[PDB]
């Protein structure tokens, strides 16, 4: 339960030949729905999810205008920023911003986000009250001042309550089979003998959706989270994810260890031990 529509945008000031100078991707929860570009000022749009085939042409028509517009502003801001930080003219700079809105399990508006970064670092962020901005230095304080005088927050608020809400609800209703699901993880403990006589126990969790999961190993009732090796959750590539957590244990003492998997697709957490 609880869903979110999110866009990640990136503008680059010295792309290269055949590389976009603007690119944005949209997601509804952990599923990507589209990709937008601008290579040499020519917008491109591509669907990446099933429910997009049920999107009437009035959608792609307005988007193309939005991409051209945003691509145009982005290149302007890059130049302005470069001038404001007094940076030299021949560098490769990135401006990134995320825009999102989420609704609760009862489908009401929970909140919305707007944040920018210049060159990999926060730059400006819109507050939870959706009216004040938090800046991080004198340059962004200049920006904060301008967006505050101009009244810019009210315009994002309009967008949130308008297009964002509209697209979320629609994508959820038309993408139902995909987004309003929760596939449970396939878990198992693997056993690998190290050479000093000891063994690695790897607790696997495969094929789950959403990506949010918790694998924790325990000795008796001792939480081994600081001492266990963990990989960040990774995409299997078919819309599902995987992850594994390993601990090293002396041979013979294997039954002492338990793996716990917590996923919203599971009815109750699984508690696996090595079998055999």
């Amino acid at each position: 339960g609880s869903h979110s529509l999110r866009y990640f945008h990136t503008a680059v000031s010295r792309p290269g030949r055949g590389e976009p100078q603007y690119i944005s991707v949209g997601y509804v929860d952990d599923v990507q729905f589209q990709r937008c570009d601008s290579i040499e000022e020519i917008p491109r749009m591509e669907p990446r999810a099933p429910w997009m085939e049920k999107e009437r042409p009035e959608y792609w028509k307005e988007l193309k205008l939005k991409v051209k517009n945003i691509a145009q502003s982005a290149r302007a801001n890059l130049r302005t920023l470069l001038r404001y930080y007094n940076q030299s003219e021949g560098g490769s700079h990135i401006l990134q911003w995320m825009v999102s809105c989420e609704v609760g399990p009862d489908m009401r508006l929970l909140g919305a986000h707007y944040q920018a970064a210049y060159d990999g670092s926060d730059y400006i962020t819109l507050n939870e009250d959706l009216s004040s901005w938090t800046a991080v230095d004198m340059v962004s304080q200049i920006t904060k001042s301008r967006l505050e005088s101009a009244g810019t927050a009210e315009y994002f608020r309009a967008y949130v309550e308008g297009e964002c809400l509209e697209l979320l609800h629609r994508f959820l209703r038309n993408g139902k089979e995909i987004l309003q699901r929760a596939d449970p993880p396939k878990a198992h403990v693997a056993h690998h003998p190290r050479p000093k006589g000891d063994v690695t126990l790897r607790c696997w969790a495969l094929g789950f959706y959403p990506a949010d999961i918790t694998l924790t190993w325990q000795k008796d009732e001792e939480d081994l989270t600081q001492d266990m090796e963990l990989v960040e959750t990774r995409p299997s590539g078919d819309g599902t994810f995987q992850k594994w957590a390993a601990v090293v244990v002396p041979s013979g003492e294997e039954q002492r260890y338990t793996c716990y998997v917590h996923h919203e697709g599971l009815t109750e957490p699984l508690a696996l031990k090595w079998r055999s």
């Binding site: 944005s24 801001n77 302005t80 920023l81 707007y114």
Partner: peptide, 9 residues
């Protein structure tokens, strides 16, 4: 799909 004019619009 929104962009606020960071600087000088």
């Amino acid at each position: 799909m929104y962009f606020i004019n960071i600087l000088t619009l």
